[PDB]
């Protein structure tokens, strides 16, 4: 904890198209998918984004379907592009995100997305941007990176 909301602030620095003001705004996967496209548009391309349904509303079953596709993508990216540098021993429980808006599990998913950004080809620029954020956010991001980069 203290992860989800600091990482929400970080997510907000991408200024994606979908609303990203609240925890609930992240539960259907669309914001996450748009952020991943910004992180690596060569991998998280339009063909991939098309699989994420928009206008989900309160349909938690579709939320979960979207989130499973997002997590699949992250884990494939980690394996195929990042050489397994992100620690994926504990997977976020996307069912609890969909069914209960569980912000702790959401924080874990956001941590994986952070791991993509700080290991992608543009990692220098993502890290430099983090270094401009509020100190309280940077400290949580630091702890999150320590965890995800450890073996």
């Amino acid at each position: 904890a203290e992860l989800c909301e600091s990482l929400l602030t970080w997510i907000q620095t991408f200024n994606v198209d979908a609303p990203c003001q609240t925890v609930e705004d992240l539960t259907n996967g669309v914001v996450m998918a748009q952020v991943l496209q910004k992180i690596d548009p060569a991998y998280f391309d339009e063909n991939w984004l098309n699989r994420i349904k928009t206008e989900v509303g309160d349909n938690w079953r579709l939320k979960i379907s979207n989130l499973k596709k997002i997590l699949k993508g992250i884990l494939d990216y980690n394996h195929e592009i990042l050489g397994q540098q992100i620690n994926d021993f504990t997977l976020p429980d996307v069912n609890l995100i969909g069914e209960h808006s569980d912000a702790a599990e959401l924080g874990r998913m956001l941590q994986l997305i952070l791991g993509c950004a700080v290991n992608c080809e543009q990692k220098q620029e993502y890290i430099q941007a983090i270094m401009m954020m509020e100190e309280s956010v940077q400290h949580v991001v630091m702890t999150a990176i320590q965890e995800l980069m450890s073996k």
Partner: peptide, 14 residues
């Protein structure tokens, strides 16, 4: 907190 910069610059150094 300046030590935060050491952490992030250390990532950049790797």
């Amino acid at each position: 907190e300046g030590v935060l910069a050491n952490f992030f610059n250390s990532l950049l150094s790797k």
